[PDB]
């Protein structure tokens with residue numbers, strides 16, 4: 563036997579999962595299309611009506627679950643939505659999906675892109691978590707993508723930028739408990755970022771302590787190494803995203819421009835663009851002095867003695883001179899000997915990594931220092947102005 567509420571139809575045996583409110587997701591069909599059917603209860607009819615409407619307005623984005631139809635009977639309301647592979651919670655909690663060869667930073671780009679679309683439409687999610695972030699079915703070209711999904715707890719803003727004081731514990735922003743705004747979704751995103759990166763951990767600890775810890779601002783990003791470039795860049799972003807002060811949190815569009823998302827080519831191109839921007843530039847200059855404000859430690863006192871034996875043969879405590887050296891070796895790469903291009907190359911991937919491995923604070927330091935040129939035409943692909 564099957565449930566038929568035309569054009570929506572599902573077999574009650576095929577249950578994908580649940581929803582804490584009493585809602586249950588099934589595998590079903592709408593208009594000869596394989597869909598996921600959500601069976602919401604009469605008490606929750608308000609949520610579904612908000613949900614269906616906000617989806618009608620935003621499902622055209624690729625990182626937002628496609629909504630199909632809504633049909634009511636004498637007992638329930640049914641929502642036909644896009645059928646996906648699994649949730650982000652199942653993806654992270656089961657390392658079988660690893661064979662799918664999905665890129666963690668790309669799922670997060672897709673999730674942030676989906677969220678950034680919502681925010682632009684003046685929609686705050688208020689319930690962003692791994693259960694609601696879904697992993698699509700592979701298309702004809704084998705591509706899989708992340709999507710936003712539980713639209714029940716959303717709120718559309720208007721003239722002003724304020725929400726009033728609600729969700730699922732462990733992922734709620736501190737201000738929603740204690741005015742709240744789009745930055746509530748940035749906090750929940752920050753937690754989701756660390757959870758995928760750490761392959762299961764959460765900044766605020768174990769599932770039951772998490773919300774009590776958010777209230778106390780007691781967190782840990784200890785899966786991130788202080789001297790591993792990949793982890794260092796990741797920490798920078800996550801720390802700002804999970805800030806106890808909403809004012810200190812970056813916007814969705816700010817998050818998408820962060821080096822965390824940059825390719826190895828982009829990472830190297832940024833080092834070219836900055837070292838090209840410096841000179842002609844005097845030390846007394848507010849750009850040079852801001853960049854020199856620090857390492858020393860970033861450059862590990864002398865950036866020459868920690869470099870490879872064949873490269874050192876080809877000031878020694880300057881980030882400005884280290885980046886100038888990098889520019890000179892990148893430019894004159896094919897007009898350089900085989901011995902030095904073997905230990906450094908191949909350009910661009912293995913080239914930039916040679917310095918990011920040996921100096922894990924170089925990109926993180928240069929990026930937040932060079933934030934002074936955030937308005938410049940040259941630095942538009944690096945910051946959000």
Ligand SMILES: COc1cc(-c2cnc3ccc(NC(C)C)nn23)ccc1C(N)=O
Nearest residue numbers: 578579598644645646647648693694711712
């Ligand atoms: C989180 O709930 C949703 C899930 C789906 C959905 C679509 N395809 C799949 C495949 C597996 C699956 N696993 C279950 C939920 C554990 N869910 N799901 C679609 C929409 C919603 C919503 N809350 O609106």
